[PDB]
Structures are given as structure tokens and as C-alpha cells.
């Protein structure tokens, strides 16, 4: 409870670790594009959970996209946000307290365009799912 428990994936855990140790100077990009670290509260364990995701930024808001590399199912961090939308978003040296809001309609469309601009592969994922990919807006706390 309130304790960070890393992803069981050694590679993900290791990427979170290097990013935090270096303010994103290490492990700060994937596919040549910037990452941020999302911290959520585990809805079952109360553990703090930390997840690298693509950076998608505008006016101090961040959108996070629950694509899980084009996996069929939602990732755990998505359920965590639905249970408690409070999160931390680390972008390099800045650590923001934010609250998540899942997007729909024209607002979603706007951030989806921003997300695909940032990481075109997201469109490939959506094309390959019949389920709408969750896009959550992280707003300043
Ligand atoms: C593997 C799983 O992680 P996850 O939360 O499902 O997240 C899956 C992935 O999205 C996560 O690995 C992302 O970091 C992958 N990922 C991206 N994932 C994305 O979805 N979008 C991205 O843009 C993205 C970019 C990215 C860039 C670099 C990189 O290295 C990884 C990237 C996990 O940690 N499972 C834990 C539990 C985690 C958890 O939060 N448990 C909750 C309960 C959750 C529940 O109720 O089911 C708790 O503790 O209470 C476990 O099995 O022990």
C-alpha cells in the first residue's frame, strides 16, 4: 500500500528504473520517440504501479493510450485509473500529480490525432482491433 511494486516484466521494470534514476536521460525513448512514466494505484493491491507509455502532450495535459502493443485486452494500469483516476506522470525531471479522464467524441478525436502524430503505430493497433482503444486525458491536479 503506497509501496512501488515493479512490473513482473524485468524489461519494463528495468526501463522504469533507468528512466527515474536519470530524469529520462536513459531509457527515455522507444522507436526514437519520447516516453513518460505513468504511476497508478493498484486497484487490488493498493501498490503503486509504474508504466512507460508514449509521450503525447499539449497545453500541459497528457493523453495516455491503453494499447498494450496491440494486445486484445486492457492493461492493468487502465483498470487502476478507472478505480482511482489519480496518477503521477513523470516527464523527464517533472513529476506531475494528475487526474485521468477517459475521452469520447470530438475531444477523443482531437487527442487521437495528436497521439497518432506522436506514434503512428497507434493507428495500426486501432485498425487491428474492433474495440475502441481507451484514450485517457491526464489533467493537472
Ligand atoms: C504486465 C502488467 O502491466 P500492465 O499494467 O498490464 O501494462 C501493460 C503495458 O501497457 C505496459 O507494460 C506498458 O509499459 C507497455 N508500453 C505501453 N503500453 C501502452 O499501453 N501504451 C503505450 O503507449 C506504451 C508505450 C511503451 C513504451 C515503452 C515501453 O517499454 C513500454 C510501453 C503488469 O504489470 N501486471 C502486474 C499487475 C499490475 C497491476 O497494476 N495490478 C493491479 C491490479 C490490476 C487488475 O485489477 O487487474 C494491482 O496491483 O492492484 C502483474 O501481473 O503482477
Author numbering: 6 to 146
Anything the authors wrote about it?
In order to characterize a full-length enzyme including the N terminus, we also determined the structure of nfa33440, a homolog from N. farcinica sharing 42% sequence identity to Ddn and that was active in the PA-824 in vitro assay. The structure of this protein was solved by molecular replacement using the Ddn structure. Although an initial apo structure lacked density for the first 37 amino acids, a cocrystal of nfa33440 with F420 confirmed that the overall structure and coenzyme binding are very similar to that of Ddn (rmsd is 0.95 Å over 109 aligned Cα atoms to Holo-1). The N terminus of nfa33440 is represented in the electron density starting at residue 6, showing an extended sequence packed against the core of the protein followed by a short α helix flanking the F420 binding site. Although interpretation is uncertain without assigning the spectrum, these data, along with the lack of density for the N terminus in the apo-nfa33440 crystal, suggest that nfa33440 in solution consists of a structured core with the N terminus undergoing conformational exchange processes similar to the Ddn mutants. In the lowest-energy model, the nitroimidazole group of PA-824 is located near the Re face of F420, with the nitro group H bonded with the side chains of S78, Y130, and Y136. Notably, S78 in Ddn and S72 in nfa33440 are bound to a water modeled near some chains of the crystal structures (shown for Holo-1, chain E in Figure 3D), which may mimic binding to one oxygen atom of the nitro group of PA-824. Mutation of S78 (nfa33440 S72) resulted in loss of activity, as did perturbation of nearby residues likely to help position S78 (Ddn R142, I144; nfa33440 R136, I138). The proposed role of the Ddn Y130 (nfa33440 Y124) hydroxyl for substrate binding and orientation was also substantiated because mutation of Tyr to Phe significantly lowered catalytic competence in either enzyme.
A deazaflavin-dependent nitroreductase (Ddn) from Mycobacterium tuberculosis catalyzes the reduction of nitroimidazoles such as PA-824, resulting in intracellular release of lethal reactive nitrogen species. The N-terminal 30 residues of Ddn are functionally important but are flexible or access multiple conformations, preventing structural characterization of the full-length, enzymatically active enzyme. The split barrel-like fold is characterized by a central six-stranded antiparallel β barrel in a Greek key topology with four α helices: A at the N terminus (the putative helix removed for Ddn structure determination), B after an extended loop between strands β3 and β4, and C and D between strands β5 and β6. The identification of these residues and the lack of classic catalytic residues in the active site suggest that Ddn functions primarily by precisely orienting PA-824 for efficient direct hydride transfer from F420 and potentially through additional transition-state stabilization.
